[PDB]
Structure formats: C-alpha cells, structure tokens
C-alpha cells in the first residue's frame, strides 16, 4: 500500500478509519524537513500537514515519490505551491471547516478591544480594586461605544464575509477592500467597498485581516501603511502573521498611534510575550493560533483531508480532488 | 437655591452646566449613609447616585428635605424604592444610555467562554509555549462551535433584546424566559419563549442574565436551580450580583457541572479573586462592573440624570419626570 505521512504531528486517529484499506499511515512529528526519516522522503506518496512546517522548493525536491500534499486547514502560504505544481505535486486544502470558528474568534477579539474584558480581567487578577465609579471609568478607560464605528475588512472571502455579517448586528459600519473579487458582492451582502488599501485604512476605526498571505501582501501593514491608519485605530489579525510588520506595529502601540491590537497569528510562531519585537508593546492581546479551533472543526477538517488523500490514491490526480489549489 | 448631593462620587463636572442656575451641587464621596455630612441629610432636596451605596428605609428617613433620588444608570435594586415612595420620595433612573454597551460586553463574555480568548491570552502571559497543533488543541481545549448551540436569556427587556439580536447573527438558537412580558414579543423578534425558569435552564447551553434584581429573584441561580442547568453549561451575568448564589456557583465550577462563567457583577462589590466564595473556582472570568461603561454612555446618562433633577426642581413631582420608577 502507498505510504502517507503526517508531517508536523503525531495523532492520526481520526484519519485512520478512512485511510485503513488504502494507505499505510506514518507520522513524523517534524518541525522541519531535516527531521523527516529517509523512508518518508523516499517513499511517501501522500503527505498530510498543518501550518507548523514550511515546504520550500528545496524541501519538495527531497521527496522522490510524493504525488499529493493535503493541508489540514485552509491557509497554504506555508507551502511553495507553484514549485510543487512544477515538480508534479498536487496540493490541496480544507477550506470550510473553521470559517465560523474563526469569524467568532475574530468578533471576540474586536469586542475585547472595544469593551476591554480581557484587560479588565487581567486587571482584577493583578489585584486592582475597583470600588468607585470614578475607579471604574479609570480602569475601563478607552472602552468605547461600537454603534457608528467603522470596521474595515481586508479580504472578503469566507471568513471576512462571516465577520461582516456578525459586525452589522453590533451597529458597525462595514467597509471592505479585496482587489481580487468581481464587483457586485458588496451589493449582494449590503456592504460598502473601497478600491485601495489606503482608502480602507483611512476610513476605519477597527481594521481586521482576513486575506490569504501571498507573494504580493507580505508586510501589508508596515511603516508606510501603518501611517495611513486612523489615529487610535484598532488592529485585529486572525489571518497570517506575515501580513504585519511587528516592528512597525510595536512602535505604533508604544506611541499610541494604534490604540490596541489583537493577534491570533504572528511572524514567528509559537509566539512569546518575552521574545521578539512585540516584547514590550502595550495594549496587545494575543492567542496561540487557536481561532480555528473547535472539536467539531478539528474532526471535520481531519476527516475531509483524509478523504482527499483517499481520492488522490484511489482515482486520478488532479481530477478526483475537490480542493486542489494549484491545478 | 435647593441643595442637590452626589452621594457615592466626587466628579460633578458633567452635571454642573445643566444644574448651575437651578441647584447648589455638593458631593459626598460616600460608600455609606454613615459618611454623609449632617448638612446634606438635613437640607438636600435632590440626590444623584450610582450603584455603590445602598438606601434602606433607615437611610431614607435620615433625609429631612429630600424630594428626589435620581440613579445615574438603570438598575435601582440598591434603593428601597417602595419605602422611598411611602416617605414621599420620587425615585428615577436612566434606563437607555448603556443598553448596547452592556449587550456588547455580554456578547464579549459569551464569546470569551466559547472561544477562550481571554484564557488563551492568560496562558500566553504565563509563558505556556504552544508549538504544535496537538498543543493548540490542549491549550484551547473546551473551545466550542457556536452554531446550533442554545442561548437562554433570562429577562428580555432592553439588554436581553439587544443580546438576542446579536446572538442570532452567530447561529445561536435563542430562548428566553421573562414572566412579566405580555405575549407576542417573541413573535415580533422571532424568538422562542419558555414558561419557566426550569425550562430555560434545561434547554440552554449558555445561560445569560438580563433581569432586574427584585424582591422575588434573589439567588435565582442557587443550589436547587444550578442542578437544573445542562451539564457543562456556561453562565453569564452582567445583570446583578444578587441573582446568583456564588457558593453554589463555585462548587459547580469546581465539580465541572458548570463549564465556565463570566461575571461583571457580584454579590459583594468590589470583587477580588483573593476574597469570597469564588476565591478558588476554576473557569471564571470577571470584570469590575464595567459592562455599562463607554465615554459616550457615561456622559449621556450623567446629562440625562442632571436634567431629571432639574425637572424635579423646576416643575412638579412626579408629573415633570421622564423616568420616575415608583409613581
Ligand atoms: N487563525 C486561524 O486559525 C485561521 C483560520 C482560518 C483561516 N485563517 C487564515 O485567514 C485567511 C482567510 O480565510 P478564508 O477562508 O476567508 O480565505 P478565502 O480564500 O475564503 O478568502 C481570502 C480572501 O482574501 C482576498 N485577498 C487576497 N489577498 C488580498 C489583499 N492583498 N488584500 C485584500 N484582500 C485579499 C482574496 O481575494 C479572498 O477573497 C486564510 O488564508 C487563512 O490563512 C486563519
Ligand atoms: N453590568 C452593568 O453595567 C449593567 C448595565 C446595564 C444594566 N445592568 C443590569 O441589567 C438589568 C437589565 O437591564 P435592562 O435595561 O434590560 O432592564 P429592563 O427593565 O429593560 O429589562 C429587565 C427585564 O427583566 C425582566 N425580569 C424581571 N424579573 C425577572 C425574573 N425573575 N425572571 C425573568 N425575567 C425577569 C423584566 O420583565 C424586564 O423585561 C438591569 O436591571 C440592570 O441592573 C447592568
Ligand atoms: C488546523 S491549523 C489551520 C489554521 C489556519 O490558520 C488555516 O488553516 O488557515
Ligand atoms: C453608572 S453605573 C450603572 C451600572 C448598572 O449596573 C446599572 O445602571 O444597571
């Protein structure tokens, strides 16, 4: 039976009943390609993977039998996809399993910035006593009324759309910028669209990222673009860490140009509050790439991924695949 | 000019331009009646107050000239209202200034329980390193998919309604219980209504409190009713601390019968994580009675309160009052 390897993990229990009579399944628990056994590189026909390992062209060439990579999850910036296709390797993803989880975590982050719940909780853990109204106003200082505020969405695909719909219900005015959609989706969903990133950032009280990370948007938020954002704007990122220059973000937080930021993703993951450019930044909320996570979403995407592998092996690449992203 | 006293605060700057030519304004910065100067008790014609001081009949009798109490805010459980009216004292509130602030903080709490953002942030502050997917699943364990879950709302007045509308947008199935509304409001807003508290608690995955605290609902949530809630249900309280028996809540958190609770209000305020029945309870998020707070809401309710005082003094009690709650 063909070999299929789980690259950056150990647990295969969900995939096993689907793949039993179809593939031999192995895991590598690998943080990098230098940690994969020679057998896998030599023999693996398929590969399952998350976001915690990167495949450059170098890495892909080390595989001598590999015909399919399936990401367990939606983002595939961590695979050099064009090179994979040149090397005759089909790459797929799982686009839909965690859309609402991610939108809900996004809304949770937005609300946490506006209503300061996480910071107020921290404050209480720290032993701050809040006895008088005056003290409530001070400890909660910066907490703001949402109705009439403008949420700017960068990228209006699955998550951005789920986010927009939720945001309307709190009285946000929602703008988006997405240079790759054909026109009319703004009408369909009753949103306002803007042509440029700069228009979005200029008009937005809270800016939230929901685009894939691609060759053209590394450090989309940087020293230049940060300077285009409203004074005292919020920033939210549950998309990809590489869309933001943490050095510019940090300075901006220190200087108060950005009032607060909520980040589930980071340039270098795992994230620590003790290492990197963000080390000392005030007004920062962070989560460990967990916006996607629910038990149902985890199970859902694992089973769909397993099936995609099965379809690869059992049928015809790339015809038998539902979610190949480099045909 | 008549004397008007701000009882449990110092700052009068917002009220002053409205009350200048109408009343002499004083403050008491009082946590209790035993802290108010004799002049105020003797002469005060009106009183402005928050939630941090209580007026029993005893306290109200100590006032010899007092004709109006205006709460700066909506909840008036902290004033013995019936006795005030007997003693010839008009009591008013400010019902509308912070409805959406409170609904938004409520949604923030709900989402924080389901998506664990606050706890995940804490975790990162504590130096937990979350490198692998397996580690993400463990640190985020308990994070759940919202669509199809049931939110049970107890009290469907202003805040409960704003909460319900927001919750629909995340795919919550919304039930409410409110024994004082006439029928049909459920149809108007497209919700499901249940007849008893027990029906609500039985069917609800997350239970959220939005009723006034009154003579009939002290410890609404207690040893008995806690036992009626779903196993692993969440509880949210931005209403009043006295609706919940923290002793039963605590045990329930320890035993895992309630999976998590988010509390902006508490039996004894200010709240400390080092004192009281909740001291050791796991899975607890808390905020220092700040759900109401935004700068606009604060200003809004202060100006409206001031005007109500002005209307009291300038015109006819109780006819000239917009928000007298004991006519
Ligand atoms: N934190 C998490 O756990 C988590 C979970 C799910 C998705 N994500 C990330 O969030 C991203 C969004 O997810 P999705 O499912 O909505 O993806 P999607 O493909 O459905 O939508 C992405 C949208 O971004 C747009 N876009 C691309 N580049 C852009 C740019 N420079 N400016 C503006 N718009 C741009 C595309 O046109 C597309 O409409 C994913 O790529 C993924 O990496 C993170
Ligand atoms: N944490 C905060 O900062 C904050 C802010 C605003 C309000 N609050 C509190 O939340 C409460 C709700 O605010 P609101 O403006 O919606 O009040 P509201 O008067 O508009 O609505 C309260 C509703 O609760 C219902 N009710 C009363 N007793 C009940 C019971 N035993 N079971 C079920 N329903 C019951 C009433 O019928 C009413 O419809 C207020 O009384 C206030 O104390 C807290
Ligand atoms: C199962 S990890 C996936 C998380 C993610 O960020 C993505 O897929 O886009
Ligand atoms: C301005 S404090 C008011 C807060 C509150 O809980 C209420 O008014 O109901």
Pocket of ligand 4 (CB under 6 A): A 133; B 50-51, 72-75, 292
Residue A193 and residue A103 share a domain: yes
Phi, psi of A16, rounded to the nearest 5 degrees: -60, -45
Q: Is A277 in the pocket of ligand 1 (CB under 6 A)?
A: no
Nearest-10 crossing angle of helices B158-168, B99-115? 50
Distance CA B228, CA B233 (A): 10
A39-47 long-range contacts, CB within 8 A, separation 24+: A39/A3, A40/A3, A40/A5, A43/A3, A44/A3, A44/A4, A44/A5, A45/A2, A45/A3, A45/A4, A45/A313, A46/A2, A46/A3, A46/A4, A46/A5, A46/A70, A46/A309, A46/A312, A46/A313, A47/A4, A47/A5, A47/A6, A47/A7
Q: Cβ-count burial of B110 within 10 angstroms (0-12 exposed, 13-18 middle, 19+ buried)? A: buried
- Of A86, A98, A135, nearest to A302 by C-alpha is A98
Identify the residue whose tokens are 């590999």.
Answer: A66
Resolution expressed in Å: 2.4
Residue B317 and residue B273 share a domain: no
Two tokens, residue A241: 């860490």
Cβ-based neighbours of A40, under 8 Å, separated by 6 or more: A3, A5, A26, A28
Distance CA B256, CA B230 (A): 11
Distance CA B52, CA A104 (A): 34
- Of A205, A204, A282, A138, nearest to B295 by C-alpha is A138
- Torsion of Cα atoms, B127 then B131 then B133 then B137, to 10°: -10
Contact B173, B192 (CB under 8 A): yes
Residue A172 and residue A72 share a domain: no
Distance CA A9, CA B33 (A): 64
Residue B254 and residue B164 share a domain: yes
Residue A298 and residue A280 share a domain: no
Q: How many CB pairs under 8 A join A and B?
A: 201
To test the pocket of ligand 2, the residue of B54, B71, B75, B204 to mutate (highest count of ligand atoms within 8 Å of its CB) is B75
DSSP B35: G
Distance CA B55, CA A276 (A): 53
Residue B68 and residue B124 share a domain: no
Residue B48 and residue B149 share a domain: no
Phi, psi of A44, rounded to the nearest 5 degrees: -60, 120
Distance CA A58, CA A54 (A): 11
Q: Give the CATH number for residue B321.
A: 3.40.50.720
Atom 18 of ligand 1: nearest residue by CA position: A157
- Of A30, A24, A25, nearest to A7 by C-alpha is A30
| Closest by Cβ to A109, choosing from B117, B129, B134 | B117
Distance CA A56, CA A66 (A): 14
Distance CA A51, CA B61 (A): 69
Residue A323 and residue A286 share a domain: no
Residue B135 and residue B205 share a domain: yes
Distance CA B73, CA B146 (A): 32
Residue B187, domain extent: 99-292
The residue in chain A having the minimum alpha-carbon distance to the alpha carbon of residue B145 is: A294
Q: Other CB atoms closer than 10 Å to residue A31's CB: what's the count?
A: 14
Distance CA B42, CA B38 (A): 6
Identify the residue whose tokens are 């980040």.
Answer: A263
Residue A134 and residue A162 share a domain: yes
Two tokens, residue B304: 């409206």
DSSP B129: -
Ligand nearest to the CA of B225: 2
Residue A70 and residue A118 share a domain: no
Q: How far is CA B274 from CA A29, A122, A135, A310, B52, in A?
A: 42, 14, 19, 55, 20
Pocket of ligand 2 (CB under 6 A): B 74-75, 95, 98-99, 102, 154-160, 177-181, 210-212, 214, 217, 220, 238-240, 264-265, 289, 291-292
**Total tally of structural domains belonging to chain A:** 2
C-alpha A102, offset from chain centre: 8
Residue B170 and residue B81 share a domain: no
Phi, psi of B182, rounded to the nearest 5 degrees: -75, 160
């Amino acid at each position: 039976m063909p070999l299929v390897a789980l690259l950056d993990g150990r647990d295969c229990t969900v995939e096993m009943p689907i793949l039993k009579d179809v593939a031999t399944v192995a895991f590598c628990d690998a943080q990098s390609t230098q940690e994969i056994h020679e057998k896998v590189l030599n023999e693996a026909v398929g590969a399952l993977m998350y976001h915690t390992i990167t495949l450059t062209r170098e890495d892909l060439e080390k595989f001598k039998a590999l015909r399919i990579i399936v990401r367990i999850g939606s983002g595939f910036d961590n695979i050099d996809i064009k090179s994979a296709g040149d090397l005759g390797i089909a790459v797929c993803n799982v686009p839909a399993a965690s859309v609402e989880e991610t939108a809900d975590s996004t809304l949770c982050h937005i609300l946490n910035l506006y209503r300061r719940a996480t910071w107020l909780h921290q404050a209480l853990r720290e032993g701050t006593r809040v006895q008088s109204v005056e003290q409530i106003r001070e400890v909660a200082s910066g907490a703001a009324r949402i109705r009439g505020e403008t949420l700017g969405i960068i990228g209006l695909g699955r998550v951005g759309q789920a986010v927009a719909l939720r945001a309307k219900a709190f009285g946000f005015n929602v703008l988006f910028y997405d240079p790759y959609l054909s026109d009319g989706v703004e009408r369909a969903l009753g949103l306002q669209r803007v042509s440029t990133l700069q228009d979005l950032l200029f008009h937005s009280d809270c800016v939230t990222l929901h685009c894939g990370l691609n060759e053209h948007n590394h450090h989309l938020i940087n020293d230049f673009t940060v300077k285009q954002m409203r004074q005292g704007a919020f920033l939210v990122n549950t998309a990809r860490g590489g869309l933001v220059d943490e050095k510019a973000l940090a300075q901006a937080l220190k200087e108060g140009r950005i009032r607060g930021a909520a980040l589930d993703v980071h340039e270098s993951e795992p994230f620590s509050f003790s290492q990197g450019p963000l080390k000392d930044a005030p007004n920062l909320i962070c989560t460990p790439h967990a916006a996607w996570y629910s038990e149902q979403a985890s199970i859902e995407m694992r089973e769909e991924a397993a099936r995609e592998i099965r379809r690869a092996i059992t049928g015809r690449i790339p015809d038998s695949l539902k979610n190949c992203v480099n045909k």
